[PDB]
Design an enzyme around this catalytic site. Structure first.
Site, mmCIF file in Angstrom:
data_model
loop_
_atom_site.group_PDB
_atom_site.id
_atom_site.type_symbol
_atom_site.label_atom_id
_atom_site.label_comp_id
_atom_site.label_asym_id
_atom_site.label_seq_id
_atom_site.Cartn_x
_atom_site.Cartn_y
_atom_site.Cartn_z
ATOM 1 N N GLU A 35 0.817 -1.201 0.000
ATOM 2 C CA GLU A 35 0.000 0.000 0.000
ATOM 3 C C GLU A 35 0.846 1.243 0.000
ATOM 4 O OE1 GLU A 35 -2.831 0.228 -0.669
ATOM 5 O OE2 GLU A 35 -3.959 -1.470 0.030
ATOM 6 N N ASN A 46 -7.782 8.748 -5.105
ATOM 7 C CA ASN A 46 -8.599 7.749 -5.758
ATOM 8 C C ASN A 46 -9.432 8.416 -6.816
ATOM 9 O OD1 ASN A 46 -7.781 5.736 -3.954
ATOM 10 N ND2 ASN A 46 -9.175 6.548 -2.469
ATOM 11 N N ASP A 48 -12.482 8.528 -7.149
ATOM 12 C CA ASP A 48 -13.689 9.184 -6.686
ATOM 13 C C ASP A 48 -13.386 10.481 -5.966
ATOM 14 O OD1 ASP A 48 -12.627 8.294 -4.333
ATOM 15 O OD2 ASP A 48 -14.515 7.559 -3.567
ATOM 16 N N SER A 50 -11.560 10.664 -3.266
ATOM 17 C CA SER A 50 -11.062 10.400 -1.953
ATOM 18 C C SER A 50 -9.581 10.161 -2.065
ATOM 19 C CB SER A 50 -11.757 9.193 -1.340
ATOM 20 O OG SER A 50 -11.507 8.015 -2.071
ATOM 21 N N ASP A 52 -6.221 8.128 -0.108
ATOM 22 C CA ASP A 52 -5.764 7.097 0.791
ATOM 23 C C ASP A 52 -4.544 7.628 1.505
ATOM 24 O OD1 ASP A 52 -7.474 5.290 -0.659
ATOM 25 O OD2 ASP A 52 -6.003 5.635 -2.263
ATOM 26 N N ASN A 59 -8.603 5.086 3.310
ATOM 27 C CA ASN A 59 -9.212 6.052 2.434
ATOM 28 C C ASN A 59 -10.147 6.966 3.188
ATOM 29 O OD1 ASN A 59 -12.128 5.473 2.012
ATOM 30 N ND2 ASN A 59 -11.297 3.440 1.637
HETATM 31 C C1 LIG Z 1 -8.933 0.253 3.734
HETATM 32 C C2 LIG Z 1 -8.645 1.213 2.604
HETATM 33 O O1 LIG Z 1 -8.913 2.345 2.710
HETATM 34 N N1 LIG Z 1 -8.083 0.668 1.417
HETATM 35 C C3 LIG Z 1 -7.787 1.501 0.304
HETATM 36 C C4 LIG Z 1 -8.839 1.284 -0.753
HETATM 37 O O2 LIG Z 1 -10.016 1.780 -0.263
HETATM 38 C C5 LIG Z 1 -8.428 2.000 -2.026
HETATM 39 O O3 LIG Z 1 -9.314 1.571 -3.005
HETATM 40 C C6 LIG Z 1 -10.102 2.604 -3.495
HETATM 41 O O4 LIG Z 1 -11.015 3.027 -2.532
HETATM 42 C C7 LIG Z 1 -11.817 4.056 -3.027
HETATM 43 C C8 LIG Z 1 -12.686 4.538 -1.881
HETATM 44 O O5 LIG Z 1 -13.498 3.484 -1.427
HETATM 45 C C9 LIG Z 1 -12.673 3.484 -4.135
HETATM 46 O O6 LIG Z 1 -13.479 4.512 -4.627
HETATM 47 C C10 LIG Z 1 -11.793 3.029 -5.260
HETATM 48 O O7 LIG Z 1 -12.515 2.427 -6.288
HETATM 49 C C11 LIG Z 1 -10.840 2.020 -4.681
HETATM 50 N N2 LIG Z 1 -9.895 1.717 -5.714
HETATM 51 C C12 LIG Z 1 -9.746 0.378 -6.155
HETATM 52 C C13 LIG Z 1 -8.735 0.134 -7.255
HETATM 53 O O8 LIG Z 1 -10.392 -0.480 -5.653
HETATM 54 C C14 LIG Z 1 -7.057 1.513 -2.394
HETATM 55 C C15 LIG Z 1 -6.621 2.321 -3.599
HETATM 56 O O9 LIG Z 1 -5.368 1.838 -4.020
HETATM 57 O O10 LIG Z 1 -6.163 1.771 -1.385
HETATM 58 C C16 LIG Z 1 -6.409 1.112 -0.200
HETATM 59 O O11 LIG Z 1 -6.371 -0.289 -0.410
HETATM 60 NA NA NA Z 2 -4.009 1.615 -2.014
#
Ligand SMILES: CC(=O)N[C@@H]1[C@@H](O)[C@H](O[C@@H]2O[C@H](CO)[C@@H](O)[C@H](O)[C@H]2NC(C)=O)[C@@H](CO)O[C@@H]1O
Ligand code: NA
Ligand SMILES: [Cl-]
Ligand SMILES: [Cl-]
Ligand SMILES: [Cl-]
Ligand SMILES: [Cl-]
Ligand SMILES: [Cl-]
Ligand code: NA
Length: 129
Positions: A35, A46, A48, A50, A52, A59
């Site tokens: 990560e 992200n 959307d 948001s 991370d 996120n």
């Molecule tokens: C626990 C946490 O926060 N994990 C992160 C993921 O949430 C991120 O994934 C992205 O999250 C956003 C917000 O929910 C989604 O809109 C977006 O689609 C999603 N992206 C993907 C590829 O699934 C992730 C992004 O790398 O990072 C953490 O894993």
């Molecule tokens: Na990530």
């Protein structure tokens, strides 16, 4: 802060992540590696809007407040900047909430794609724990 692998393992262990919700410590270290490359200051935006944050890339859509993710939740009840601290407590405590939420570590995309189903114990190999 950029943690070393074992340093982070030890920090995570001290913070109760080893076998937390059944996830051995290597899972958490693996997740952090992929990560954030063990960098507490990592941020990524992200699609959307948001962001991370931190070593576990938690996120702002759901877990923390960064003041710029409208309509989002703050389920860890923390400013997202707290997740960038060199002190991983806030990230760990939030991660514990996340992983407890029913989806386990699948919340961590990088974990799902790069750690899940692999020999995650390798991530804590050699570490004094
Ligand atoms: C626990 C946490 O926060 N994990 C992160 C993921 O949430 C991120 O994934 C992205 O999250 C956003 C917000 O929910 C989604 O809109 C977006 O689609 C999603 N992206 C993907 C590829 O699934 C992730 C992004 O790398 O990072 C953490 O894993
Ligand atoms: Na990530
Ligand atoms: Cl490394
Ligand atoms: Cl492990
Ligand atoms: Cl917001
Ligand atoms: Cl810490
Ligand atoms: Cl689970
Ligand atoms: Na939020």
């Amino acid at each position: 802060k950029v943690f070393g692998r074992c340093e982070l393992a030890a920090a995570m262990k001290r913070h109760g992540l080893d076998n937390y919700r059944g996830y051995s410590l290597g899972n958490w270290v693996c997740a952090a590696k992929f990560e954030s490359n063990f960098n507490t200051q990592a941020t990524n935006r992200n699609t959307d809007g948001s962001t991370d944050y931190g070593i576990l890339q938690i996120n702002s859509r759901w877990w923390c407040n960064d003041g710029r993710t409208p309509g989002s939740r703050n389920l860890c009840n923390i400013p997202c900047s707290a997740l960038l601290s060199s002190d991983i407590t806030a990230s760990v405590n939030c991660a514990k909430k996340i992983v407890s939420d029913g989806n386990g570590m699948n919340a961590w995309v990088a974990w799902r794609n790069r750690c899940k189903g692999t020999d995650v114990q390798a991530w804590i190999r050699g570490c004094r724990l």
